[PDB]
Design a protein around this ligand. Sequence first.
Ligand SMILES: CC1(C)OCc2c(Nc3n[nH]c4c(Cl)cccc34)nc(-c3cn[nH]c3)nc21
Length: 298
Amino acid sequence: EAPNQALLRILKETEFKKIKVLGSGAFGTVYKGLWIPEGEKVKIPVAIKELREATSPKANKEILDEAYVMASVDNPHVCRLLGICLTSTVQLIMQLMPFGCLLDYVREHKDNIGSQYLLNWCVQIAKGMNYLEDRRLVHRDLAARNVLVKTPQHVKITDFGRAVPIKWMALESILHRIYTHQSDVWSYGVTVWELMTFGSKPYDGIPASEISSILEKGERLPQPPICTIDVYMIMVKCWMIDADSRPKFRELIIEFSKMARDPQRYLVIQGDERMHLPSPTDSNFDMDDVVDADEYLI
Ligand SMILES: CC1(C)OCc2c(Nc3n[nH]c4c(Cl)cccc34)nc(-c3cn[nH]c3)nc21
């Protein structure tokens, strides 16, 4: 097939500064930083990832496989790699998404998330997913935790650089380890459910081993209180046994876009209209010569 002509950018350690830790886990440590190129008179807000501390040959392999996938994509609703740093332990550089992941965002800002935002996010996620489809790239781990927030009005898919989350998996994935663009549609349905419930845990309390039987019986995730039969029907469609019967991401873009034009007709949120999230007003944004990675291209 088509040669992958993507450019792998190597960044000098002296060109970027680590400000603070955003998160620390099994993957290692993620830092909030600033990338100051050569003498370009620009300061790019970045996120720097590093393999904890130790350097084992197999760990570097796994982080370079992520760099490969991340550098191979370019879409407004998909997270991209800015570059790699070849220190003792390899470092991944990517654009800073100041509001963190969507799952934490909806849990922490539920009292100000209106129907417009929820529906716009659904369009945005489907658009990224449709790009991943056009590029023949299957996510395998789509969930609200794997959707980063640039601005509350702009979200981007991440962690597709995996190519077990049973409660987000399609039936063919659990039983036969089948991962397709249609199995990502099921995971998308669970992601929408996560947003609509304002970050609730799917099948909370129920063990992972029982999920297979629950799904095979015909039981699915409940109708979120704010969901009209219109939105919920779409979620239900994503959770069908027949993968070809499930909607396509281009169908999901259209359907959610139709709904986003009259958001109060499709999502009933009490207190909606009087709700507002941080937007480019007063204090949305050193801080001199700062430019976003989306506007900086060499
Ligand atoms: C702390 C939290 C929310 O958890 C983990 C993680 C993460 N993981 C990454 N995955 N891939 C990355 C690359 Cl290539 C570079 C830098 C970070 C990552 N990335 C971010 C992030 C923030 N702004 N932009 C990316 N945030 C998080």
